[PDB]
Design a protein around this ligand. Structure first.
Ligand SMILES: *Cc1cc2c(cc1C)nc1c(=O)[nH]c(=O)nc-1n2C[C@H](O)[C@H](O)[C@H](O)COP(=O)(O)OP(=O)(O)OC[C@H]1O[C@@H](n2cnc3c(N)ncnc32)[C@H](O)[C@@H]1O
Ligand SMILES: *Cc1cc2c(cc1C)nc1c(=O)[nH]c(=O)nc-1n2C[C@H](O)[C@H](O)[C@H](O)COP(=O)(O)OP(=O)(O)OC[C@H]1O[C@@H](n2cnc3c(N)ncnc32)[C@H](O)[C@@H]1O
Ligand code: NA
Ligand code: NA
Lengths: 827, 827, 104
């Protein structure tokens, strides 16, 4: 098997070596600049609290695996996990409600937990002052990891299986040839490698600079304190680091706790962000590294801890009879979105990262990376973890510093899924931005782009809107980052004509004599048709899982325009193109360009769309002029445009593409032409609702690499007759009707109880699914939610969706919910 | 020699066949759908007035050649030119002044002419009512072409030399293979061809559609009338089409006149534009074509001619004793800028156009095209004539129709060189457009782009501007499309810091493993240097003439960004790239993309530029961080930018490039940072003045293909040591010091008399040059003008520049006029 | 209906505006209305100040109800009024002129 070098013998690197060995890959060298008995990164100071419940399905699964693995890691009859359970307490009504949402995540991801009353919290955790406790969330399987001991036991058993460990060894560079890694440089020479995995914790950006790779983590310090012996605890636990009570979270005050024998450990995020410059740490001679003297531990700053100490005495009055004994400011990593950084670098073939990982998720990350290296894919969806998810404006040192510090400040806060940052904003705008502001756009941001969710100009329409379109009142949570204006925008899209800004949707151009060949292998479509065809298609992995859904337009013999999901797609096509070019003939070369920022797109949709465009173009937009799922060049308002006939919202009209410099003119021409037809600008809230009424699947939510096309209901997009394409072999024999789990459309029976995503779905009282996409459907006048369900659940069956602890009745409904016969789209 | 097919036996196609034959190419077939004795296009109805004087040097030269050639074309002792001279009369003070400007063009281009008083006009042209005549311009060498007779004499002498003519033969299509022309399709089969030249007059767009080429001409009708016999003319001229008086222009009323024996001919542009749909004309059976029945002649509309008839009786009262005899509405071609359409198509190798050409310029166009075909270059600058000059928004049917109709309406109007159209406008805008409007930009347009010439916000600075910067009053003409605000913008660029919008400047990306190879052959620079270098360089033709000046930045091994002059450059690189790819190996492929519309550029210039940028970037902008004429990637205001250190205006700072979606953020970040330094936005008027103070050459004005680098003073940009590049052989042995004519900087001695361009330059009373670029120099506090001068004229010599008939004294001055030691640019 | 005390109507709006209205919109005003007048409650431009605001000025999280028609931006505007200089639009406050020999 390939020769592997892992940089870092922390909890990540040692678990990765272990997960590779179990899969029969043992030609591995693990390097650490610190001594092997105590390397001195963040693993060497972590207290090891493991709370499994998380809003992310992937992170919850990583944590469940870590608990399982650490319980299994044992020597002398003592494992590396003390399963004391975990308790999160609420001191405010806001937090109490959020614990009910978290109980929902627990059920969705298969973690057992219970909501506790104030009395039950007091029974479980007698040291609590129960007066301010409003309730708690108890998860019996949470507990305390012995991370440093796990590293030592992993080193022992992988060394026995053939892995080489070299401590006291500092990587100073990375050797490469031909765009692929060949070795790792140290003061003593080059260690050869076919594969290198950087598991370097908060030194990850320093390693990345060695190959010109931007690694978007920020080293930050976090306070952890131990008390003197607590009188109330005398004689209760094993010395010196025993624990019997559940690990304790006090998120309203940014604090967590564990026992250390008769002392308490206190972790605080309730201090200013503390960015650290790794180049100032100094090199530690390995002989000097000890418990209180290691690169990851900075001097304690007591002044930052005083408020946390006061809040601790309020929660746990027994601690007022102890004192602070020792504290430190410990360094670890934060990222712009709180997710880890996994996968193959853009810059160098065979060079991978696995960085910004809590002890809590460490074994799950290692397993996923071992699967990726040994088979070419992870068994768990890595869409939120892949290093290639970031846009270029999100990789600057300034962006990474500002947003990662904000992620630290907000780490334990209750936040709505649509909550925007207030800074940095306005990084990327479409050519229509000034017009959008004239119309009172309400902007939210994603990937750096400012995106209108609705337009205040449209509030003036509500007083003439027919009553059937008016939705009921929303509760406070589903009402956040929502407006009744969205109903009016849906109404006018369905009955008049609307202009949507589609500029931010990822746009790739694939060009060259090898473009068709590349796309024929990567996608599930037969794209070898005369130019002008627009095809919806999938990208699979070799196991048949769905990596992405894409729209391909063939604009000429050697040029294709792709509508994609994000920069994971960009990086995937870039590497595939480079490999085909490198290994191919003079006729196989192909280039991939992300053209999003240089171009723009208006979705012109609604039954009056032909009436509008006819005023500003002499091109033929009738059915004979441009058929469904076709593209052609036209002129509108004097501007050259590529028109594509398709609609996410399910109405007559076209996506209209042009260069950025022409966008404002195109906008203004269509706007003026639309005045007699009541044209409006329409935003993302209406867009999302109308598209869900059409049954569109959103990659990352409604399907991931965990699902095959047939489970997702996307069988129509796979041409099994093709001679060859990635994933074909895995899909042989599979059908929608035989799939054990199938994506289903649910509608909420009461017409009012809107759900948002991730809520667990129950069939005859058993958890069998969870909400993927959701929105209020303005045309069907009820809330909509999608979920995978067992294949034996049928259209017409009833399921319950749990929202803030309340069960909402919903019906499995045939989709599309609107115009399934496509009458609005044809002719 | 190659097999040539010419489409059209009008005055253009027959002169082209003749010019090819004289150069030893006689394997030519000329096709016309009409009968050879009277083909029936516009040549078959033209009255043949030839006025040589024109604002364009190239068009004047084409007309002078036509007069020479038509005088030489003779049979039976009668030539095809009746050299009666030409008279333009003025009835307004505006027109009288414009005739003095036109007398300047005449002197500049080597045409003899004189201004005449009202009395002299009456002596020359006794039929004038002298009361309203204010003066005239008399050019003795102008006169009347016999265009139909010339066609017949050219057919006769080229047929003798081996050319095949096929009348009654309609081209229905064009045959091609491998991207090159192979033949011409007719109802009777394919006529083979290595080269095809479309000389199809107003059917040019119909021919172009046969190969998918946009040919930006519009067929329009123009009235021409003949009177009954005029009593005052009885017995004076030879019948039936004799003429003795000069041809007569009456431009204030959009009229022209000639004699036809004792009758008058009247041409009128004083009617509504009359667009013609060529597809409605009907096919004329060749046997039916006659003087009054031919595709080019539409029914006369008397109602449109009544005002012209009244104005005619006022000018020439003798005509009130005649009547209208016959009129017609005759079809010919107009284009968006009034220039012809010459050169090789973008779409098809070996397919050329020579269309939208007046009889007046016909022989000159034919000569230039014969030179192009037989040697690879024209001996006359075709920059204003090349079909590839147009931007994509300028090729739409809507743009061509609107602007060509406006060109018809304005054909005989007095217009300032900076006069903008009022529509269509706002086609292309940069990402800074809304900010520019906040600052009160005054926009003019070129290539479809809106470009600020100054900002009204800056008027507030004039009251604190030091007196040395305040220019004198301008006269009305030089004051048009000018403001004193430009002085303030120059002042602040020289003393503080300014932000220029460089977005519209043509930006090409040349990429692929063959990119370096392509550019090494096409340019005069050795570009094989490690990435990061910015090089100013020239593109030559094989005769060593300057096709373009370009700035090349090597951004990586296989990617170069070029700053170019326009779409002639784009098309030149596109074809050269395709040819290298087609004939090359797997390592020779190269792509060319025009990235202008997808990107943007701020020129951040002035002595405070480092102070400003240091507030919004952590990158090193010191001399050690980024040296002169180098590029590197940086982050400014959170935006990824490519910074290049150079300055057209001659100050510290950089061109800052980014994608369009990031432009507004980059703008706003720099704007906010610049507040304590007094940053301003600065427009094109100041830009042009400051750049001329640095001695920058503007391609198309200061040098064309008529000049070699040494004549232009650009010898420093030619690396003669290179092994190979287009034009090297022609340049062997040439130097600046030995050049017979050299580009010189002149400053106007009185400090106030601003000149604009094209004014003739005199040395010891002889015309020896003409003004190329000109501007008021705000730093040197005097008007500046460039001109080629004989090599024997030296720095310090005095010359006169004629402006509206007045001689202005100027001094040959060493350049750059500002900071020739580059102190402001270094360190 | 259940309604928050600051809940605005969505129509009719923009009946009465001060002379500073266009400048306020340039600065991202969040407007509520009273007596027909559009009144900025905070300015989105000021969100850029939060990252340099001293920690003593940062308020705790708000619950959903008290968080309606509220922003953390208001803390920054208070901070700058107390430490720098601020421009408040007082145009809507009722202004009467009482004139004549009997006014006093
Ligand atoms: C600091 C901290 C972290 C922490 C915590 C409390 C504090 C104060 N409490 C936690 C908790 O209770 N529960 C939990 O799940 N995590 C908690 N953490 C975070 C946790 O400690 C870290 O996320 C985790 O330990 C990171 O592990 P990882 O294996 O990724 O990283 P590492 O231990 O830092 O190891 C990296 C190794 O790389 C070596 N290195 C770096 N550069 C080089 C070079 N150039 N050459 C050779 N070796 C290199 C380092 O020496 C290090 O050992
Ligand atoms: C209409 C007009 C033009 C004009 C003028 C007065 C009127 C009323 N007065 C002029 C003046 O005094 N001085 C001057 O310099 N020009 C004046 N003009 C303009 C002039 O007539 C035209 O610009 C010039 O004649 C154009 O010449 P050109 O040789 O370019 O064009 P043409 O005569 O129209 O010939 C084109 C031939 O192409 C043939 N054709 C077209 N399509 C086909 C196909 N498909 N197959 C075969 N042959 C084709 C036509 O039959 C035509 O003969
Ligand atoms: Na916090
Ligand atoms: Na006119």
């Amino acid at each position: 098997t390939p020769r592997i070098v892992i940089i870092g013998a922390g909890i990540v690197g040692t678990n990765l070596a272990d997960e590779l060995v179990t899969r029969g890959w043992n030609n591995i060298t693990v390097l650490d600049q610190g001594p092997l008995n105590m390397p001195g990164g963040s693993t060497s100071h972590a207290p090891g609290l493991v709370f499994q419940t998380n809003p992310s399905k992937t992170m919850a699964s990583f944590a469940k695996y870590t608990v399982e693995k650490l319980l299994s890691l044992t020597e002398d009859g003592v494992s590396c996990f003390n399963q004391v359970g975990g308790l999160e307490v609420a001191t405010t009504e806001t937090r109490l409600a959020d614990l009910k949402r978290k109980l929902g995540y627990a059920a969705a991801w298969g973690i057992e937990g219970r909501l506790l009353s104030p009395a039950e919290c007091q029974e479980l955790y007698p040291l609590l002052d129960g007066e301010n406790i409003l309730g708690g969330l108890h998860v019996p399987s949470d507990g305390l990891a012995s991370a440093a001991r796990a590293v030592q036991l992993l080193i022992k058993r992988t060394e026995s299986a053939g892995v080489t460990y070299r401590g006291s060894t500092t990587v100073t560079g990375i050797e490469q040839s031909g765009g692929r890694v060949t070795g790792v440089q140290t003061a003593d020479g080059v260690i050869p490698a076919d594969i290198v995995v950087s598991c370097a914790g908060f030194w990850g950006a320093k390693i990345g600079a060695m190959i010109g790779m931007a690694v978007p983590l920020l080293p930050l310090a976090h306070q952890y304190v131990k008390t003197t012996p607590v009188p109330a605890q005398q004689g209760r636990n094993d010395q010196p680091n025993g624990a019997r009570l559940p690990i304790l979270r006090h998120q309203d005050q940014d604090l967590y706790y564990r026992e250390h024998g008769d002392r308490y450990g206190i972790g605080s995020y309730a201090h200013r962000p503390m960015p650290v410059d790794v180049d100032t740490l100094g090199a530690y001679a390995p002989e000097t590294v000890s418990e209180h003297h290691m690169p990851s531990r900075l001097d304690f700053t007591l002044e930052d801890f005083l408020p946390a100490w006061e809040a601790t005495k309020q929660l746990l009055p027994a601690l007022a009879d102890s004192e602070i004994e020792d504290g430190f400011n410990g360094i670890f990593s934060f990222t712009p979105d709180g997710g880890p950084l996994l996968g193959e670098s853009k810059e160098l073939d065979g060079f991978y990262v696995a960085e910004a990982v809590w002890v809590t998720h460490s074994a799950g990350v290692a397993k996923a990376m071992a699967e990726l290296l040994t088979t070419g894919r992870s068994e768990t969806d890595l869409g939120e973890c892949d290093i290639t998810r970031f846009e270029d404006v999100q990789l600057t040192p300034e962006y990474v510093s500002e947003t990662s510090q904000q992620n630290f400040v907000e780490i334990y806060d209750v936040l709505h899924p649509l909550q925007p940052r207030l800074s940095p904003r306005n990084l990327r705008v479409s050519p229509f931005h000034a017009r959008h502001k004239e119309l009172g756009a309400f902007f939210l941001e994603a990937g750096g782009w400012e995106r209108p969710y609705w337009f205040e100009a449209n509030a003036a329409l509500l007083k003439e809107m027919p009553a059937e379109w008016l939705p009921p009142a929303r509760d406070a949570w589903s009402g956040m980052f929502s407006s009744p204006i969205a109903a009016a925008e849906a109404w006018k899209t369905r009955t008049a004509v609307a202009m949507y800004d589609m500029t931010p949707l990822k746009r790739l151009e694939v060009s060259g004599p090898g473009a068709l060949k590349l796309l024929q292998e990567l996608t599930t479509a037969d794209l070898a048709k005369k130019p002008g065809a627009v095809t919806y298609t999938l990208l699979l992995d070799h196991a048949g899982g769905v990596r992405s859904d894409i729209t391909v337009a063939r604009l000429s013999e050697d040029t294709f325009q792709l509508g994609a999901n994000g920069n994971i797609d960009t990086a995937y096509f870039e590497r595939a193109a480079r490999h085909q070019t490198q290994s191919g003939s003079a006729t196989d070369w192909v280039q991939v360009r992300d053209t999003t920022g240089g171009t723009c797109c208006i979705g012109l949709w609604g039954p009056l769309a032909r009436d509008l465009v006819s005023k500003v173009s002499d091109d033929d937009f009738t059915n004979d002029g441009l058929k469904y799922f076709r593209a052609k060049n036209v002129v509108i308002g004097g501007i050259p445009v590529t028109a594509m006939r398709l609609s996410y919202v399910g109405e007559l009209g076209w996506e209209l593409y042009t260069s950025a410099d022409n966008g404002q003119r195109l906008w203004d021409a269509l706007w003026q032409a639309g005045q007699p037809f009541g044209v409006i600008a329409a935003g993302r809230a209406a867009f999302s609702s109308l598209r869900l009424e059409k049954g569109y699947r959103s990659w990352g939510t409604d399907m991931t690499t965990e699902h095959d096309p047939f489970e997702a209901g996307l069988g129509f997009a796979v041409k099994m007759a093709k001679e060859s394409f990635i994933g074909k072999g895995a899909l042989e024999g599979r059908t929608e009707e035989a799939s054990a789990r199938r994506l289903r459309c649910l509608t909420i029976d009461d017409g009012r109880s809107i759900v948002l995503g991730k809520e667990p779905v129950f069939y005859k009282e058993q958890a069998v699914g969870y909400v993927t996409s959701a929105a209020y459907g303005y045309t069907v006048a009820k809330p909509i939610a999608y979920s995978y369900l067992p294949g034996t659940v049928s259209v017409g069956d009833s399921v319950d969706i749990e929202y803030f602890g309340r069960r909402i009745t919903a019906t499995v409904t045939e989709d599309p919910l609107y115009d399934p016969k496509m009458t609005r789209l044809r002719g």
